[PDB]
């Protein structure tokens, strides 16, 4: 199917700072991936983002009733909708499951990677640190980064390149808004 | 920001496909099934605490269609350029033999919002228990999407997520098999 495609998008955005103390609303219109016109509550009128959007800017700005709907959106739409979902979005907290297992940088080598697998948490902000004998190890650390599962949970793998010796105790430490103190998981060679 | 809520919509010609959803910090709250004219909550529990009149989405999609006609002409019928997806296959939990898990196929950074996605087990299509999200908005105004396949890990089975998109010359297959202690 090589028929040409044409895409229109609209994004009505509500940006919240300090709860609902500061709120900014954007009414954004796109052709393919190009935003062509937008209303920003910081301004209170539509402004063309590209030349393509100039007619819409002028036309919509000429309608004061339309503009007043958009000007009141931070209150009637943004603050309202925030309130509606606050309990299961803003206040959603799901603690991570934390696993540590050995791995290999190259499959024919002996184990030289410690994987700290952090799974199922929400929201996304998390801090994961590796320790060897109570000292933080900041060298040889690599991660998948933060991964969205698409189902309101995240995961990340944080790996420490190291050669385990007998006696050594490795600790993966996890900090997250759902926890009241760091979560730690030990691994011994 | 502390949080961002976006009501994101699109309408695509000539497919005549439209979508309407709410996004909170990059996760989907709900979308409207256009055909059934029903609100679909991303998580079941969301629907017990809130509601949405699906009818409202229909009116918006109508305007989206009308605006598309206008912008199509205004642009001198300049069509969209295909942007093919990046595809990643991962599990949602560390894998243990014979312990139920879920394969995730993450399809990212593409447009237009149209793809054919197949799960393959040992090279054969499988559909038992699979699920998917609708098209999710990106800040760069491309799209992303997730597909899901519950499975029981074994040393026997291998899996692929096969993705077809107009921006791709050939279907893109991303492989998964049981990792052997490495």
């Amino acid at each position: 199917d090589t028929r040409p495609r044409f895409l229109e998008q609209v994004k009505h955005e509500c940006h919240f700072f300090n709860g609902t103390e500061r709120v900014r609303f954007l009414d954004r219109y796109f052709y393919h991936q190009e935003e062509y016109v937008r209303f920003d509550s910081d301004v209170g009128e539509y402004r063309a983002v590209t030349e393509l959007g100039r007619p819409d800017a002028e036309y919509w700005n000429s309608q004061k009733d339309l503009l007043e709907q958009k000007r009141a959106a931070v209150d009637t739409y943004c603050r309202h909708n925030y309130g509606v979902g606050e309990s299961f979005t803003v206040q959603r907290r799901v603690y991570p499951e934390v696993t540590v297992y050995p791995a290999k940088t190259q499959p024919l080598q002996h184990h030289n990677l410690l994987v700290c697998s952090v799974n199922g948490f929400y929201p996304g902000s998390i801090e994961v640190r590796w320790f060897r004998n109570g000292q933080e190890e900041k060298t040889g650390v690599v991660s998948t980064g933060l991964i969205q599962n698409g189902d309101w949970t995240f995961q990340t793998l944080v790996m420490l390149e190291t050669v385990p010796r007998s006696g050594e105790v490795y600790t993966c430490q996890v900090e997250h808004p759902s926890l009241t103190s760091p979560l730690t998981v030990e691994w011994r060679a | 920001e502390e949080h961002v809520i976006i009501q994101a919509e699109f309408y695509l010609n000539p497919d005549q496909s439209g979508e309407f959803m709410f996004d909170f910090d990059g996760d989907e709250i709900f979308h409207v099934d256009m055909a059934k004219k029903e609100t679909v909550w991303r998580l079941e529990e969301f629907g017990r605490f809130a509601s949405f009149e699906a009818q409202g989405a229909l009116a918006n999609i109508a305007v989206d269609k009308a605006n598309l006609e206008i912008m199509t002409k205004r642009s001198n019928y300049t069509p969209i350029t295909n942007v093919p997806p990046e595809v990643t296959v991962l599990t949602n939990s560390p894998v243990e033999l014979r312990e139920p898990n879920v394969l995730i196929c993450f399809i990212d950074k593409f447009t237009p919002p149209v793809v054919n996605v197949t799960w393959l087990r040992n090279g054969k299509p499988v559909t038992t228990g699979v699920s998917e999200t609708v098209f999710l908005p990106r800040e760069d105004h491309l799209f992303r999407k997730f597909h899901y396949l519950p499975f029981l890990p074994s040393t026997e089975d291998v899996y692929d997520c096969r993705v077809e998109h107009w921006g791709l010359d050939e279907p893109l297959l991303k492989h998964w098999e049981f990792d052997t202690s490495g």
Binding site: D56, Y59, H80, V84 | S51, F52, E53, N60, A66
Partner: peptide, 13 residues
């Protein structure tokens, strides 16, 4: 409040 409100789309003409 328990009902999500829709933000209407501006139409060109």
């Amino acid at each position: 409040a328990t009902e999500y409100r829709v933000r209407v789309n501006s139409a060109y003409q």
